[PDB]
């Protein structure tokens, strides 16, 4: 009922590639153990970075930066988290020794946030940056972090990005070693 508007925020959506095929090929107990280990790592990483996980929807995972506490480096902070996230997914092997490939989408812009007290994920975030971020994950290529121009312009001096081959998007490659 109570909605709060944030002018600046950055939103991440992460989604497992091929999880239907994984879930159909894995015993239910081992699938639960795999997902719990992956999400326990993700949850730890979120609090380590001081961010907030807003929604976990099956094999989807939504993280916000700048809400409820605004920070001037909200886009840069989410980018460092996203790179840690994909590296965690790359190093975390199932009992078969295969990584769990992700699609990750990042966006920045205004959001609205509110408390829905009767829910588990009782703090909801919606709005422009959430809608763009979901688009970025939706159309992402396997294993990449896809971002729009507005994110690119905020990361380009500290991070390496490559333009994806009307809307132009970019792949977040990693942190610059030196400027």
């Amino acid at each position: 009922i109570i909605a709060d508007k944030y002018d600046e925020a950055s939103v991440l959506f992460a989604d497992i590639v091929g999880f239907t095929e994984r879930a159909s090929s894995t015993a239910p107990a081992d699938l639960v153990r795999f997902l719990d280990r992956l999400y326990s790592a993700f949850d730890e990483l979120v609090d380590q970075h001081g961010l907030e996980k807003i929604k976990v929807s099956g094999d989807s995972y939504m993280v916000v930066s700048g809400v409820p506490r605004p920070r001037p480096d909200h886009t840069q902070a989410l980018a460092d988290f996203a790179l840690d996230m994909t590296n965690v997914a790359a190093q975390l092997k199932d009992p078969r020794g295969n990584p769990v490939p992700l699609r990750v989408g990042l966006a920045t812009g205004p959001v609205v946030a509110g408390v829905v007290g009767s829910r588990r994920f009782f703090y909801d975030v919606w709005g422009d940056a959430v809608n763009v971020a979901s688009r970025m994950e939706s159309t992402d290529s396997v294993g990449q972090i896809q971002v729009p121009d507005e994110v690119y312009e905020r990361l380009k001096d500290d991070f390496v990005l490559r333009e994806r081959g009307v809307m132009r998007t970019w792949y977040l490659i990693g942190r610059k070693v030196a400027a």
Epitope: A41, L45, Q48, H49, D80, N87, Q91, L92, G174, V177
Partner: nanobody, 116 residues
Framework: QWQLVESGGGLVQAGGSLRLSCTAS????????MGWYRQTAGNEREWVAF???????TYADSVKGRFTISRDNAKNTVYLQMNSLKPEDTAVYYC??????????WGQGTPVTVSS
């Protein structure tokens, strides 16, 4: 080879101070996150301090205000200054990247003992 060797541990009495170092070789510190963890035994390694590549720091509630994590990119090393030490802080301390933590690749750590 990719390794992380901790050092600086030892014996101190309550209220004392220690400075732990974590030297990294095989990775470039400036593009990686680094965290410090402790294993008492009543649990597995819990994280107490975390430094991102942009310089953000966060700490566990139990140690915040008393511990400070910091970086030295030239030496490719991360530090944990420990102040106002308590018996509850006695543990083996390790450093690790997020990838090393989920990968289970740990160094041998450094012992910190708080007693008289």
């Amino acid at each position: 080879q990719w390794q992380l060797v901790e050092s600086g541990g030892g014996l101190v009495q309550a209220g004392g101070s220690l400075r732990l170092s974590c030297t990294a070789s095989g990775i470039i510190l400036s593009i990686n996150s680094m965290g410090w963890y402790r294993q008492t035994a009543g649990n597995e390694r819990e994280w107490v301090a975390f430094s991102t590549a942009g310089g953000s720091t966060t700490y566990a509630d139990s140690v915040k205000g008393r511990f400070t994590i910091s970086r030295d990119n030239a030496k490719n090393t991360v530090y944990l200054q420990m102040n106002s030490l308590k018996p509850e802080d006695t543990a083996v301390y390790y450093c690790n990247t997020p990838a090393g933590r989920v990968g289970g690749t740990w160094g041998q750590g450094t012992p910190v003992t708080v007693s008289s």
